């Protein structure tokens, strides 16, 4: 990979789960370096109007809010993650 992870500073490859901090610094982060769940990562991927903001730094989600929102969506408590922005 060309980009290093904004948390662990090791390379991010395209076959790893990784998310871009579009809210602010435009660095890539390995999913597992952020604490993001698999479900938050999946639901963020497909929500065009959501952007993620990393721990160092349209609807903005931190990892914690995306994780909380995904748990609510999978339990039928929320229609989409946008309800938690």
């Amino acid at each position: 990979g060309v980009y290093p992870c904004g948390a662990c500073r090791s390379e991010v490859n395209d076959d790893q789960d990784a998310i871009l901090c579009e809210a602010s610094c435009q660095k890539w982060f390995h999913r597992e370096c952020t604490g993001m769940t698999e479900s938050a990562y999946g639901l963020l991927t497909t929500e065009a109007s959501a952007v993620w903001a990393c721990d160092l730094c349209v609807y903005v989600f931190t990892t914690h809010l995306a994780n909380t929102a995904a748990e609510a969506v999978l339990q039928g408590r929320a229609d989409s993650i946008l309800a938690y922005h």
Binding site: A18, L20, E22, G42, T45
Partner: peptide, 6 residues
């Protein structure tokens, strides 16, 4: 949000 799965 842009991820590698995007």
């Amino acid at each position: 949000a842009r991820t590698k799965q995007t």
